[PDB]
Each structure stands twice: as structure tokens, then as C-alpha cells.
Paper text:
In the case of the glutaredoxin that is the focus of this study, glutaredoxin A from the cyanobacterium Synechocystis sp. The structure of the wild-type protein is comprised of the major protein secondary structure elements: four α-helical segments, and four mixed parallel: anti-parallel β-strands that form a single β-pleated sheet. Our random mutagenesis approach has yielded four new crystal structures of glutaredoxin A, one for each of the following variants: R27L, A75I, A79S, and P84R.
The P84R mutation is interesting from a structural perspective. A proline is present at this locus in other glutaredoxin molecules, but not all. As proline does not provide a free backbone amide hydrogen to form an H-bond to the i + 4 backbone carbonyl, it rarely occurs within a helix. In the wild-type glutaredoxin structure, there is only one i, i + 4 backbone H-bond interaction to stabilize α-helix 4. While mutation of Pro84 to arginine does not restore the complete backbone H-bond pattern typical of α-helices, it does appear to alleviate strain on the peptide backbone so an additional i, i + 4 backbone H-bond interaction can form between the backbone carbonyl of Asp83 and the backbone amine of Ser88. The R27L crystal structure lacks two neighbors; the A75I and A79S mutant have no net differences, while the P84R mutant adds three possible interactions.
Author numbering: -10 to 88
Write the structure that this text describes.
Amino acid sequence: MRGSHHHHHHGSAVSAKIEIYTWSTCPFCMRALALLKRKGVEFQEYCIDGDNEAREAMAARANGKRSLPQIFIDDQHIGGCDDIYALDGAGKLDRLLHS
């Protein structure tokens, strides 16, 4: 396989699992999406507009919270828009993303 390949016992390649539950038109969700997009990271958005079943699935993972958005990185609950911005302002978010 021609190319410039990195080796460090990675095995099968996998990357940060980044998830965000949103309503598309929530201004807090929009602000959080903008931050993740500006980082350039690959991520999954669960847009749950009008979907109560999905909100209950979200609350089950997010400490019972139904507020939006809810963000997870590598299966760890990070919190909402304020939480991710606070992490970035503290110089801690890139390391979680990771780098």
C-alpha cells in the first residue's frame, strides 16, 4: 500500500467518538455546533427535533438531563454548550478531542 504511513501499534484505526444531541434551531445547540465545526473534528449530531423518545434516550445517558445540547466525547458526558465553551476557554477541550 503506497503512502506515508504512521506506525505505533494502532491496529485497526479508530478515532474520537464525538456526539452531540440537538434541536436544530436551539440557539445553544447552534453555538455548540459552531464550536465543534470550527475545530474541524468529525462528529455525529443527533438532531432530535420533536422526538420525545430520543430525548429520553439522551436523558438516560446525560445524568437525567433533558436540557440541550448534550455532548459526549469517547462515551464520557461532557455537558452542554456552556460546558464545552468553558473547557475551550480553560485550554482543555483540544486535548479531549484529542489534540
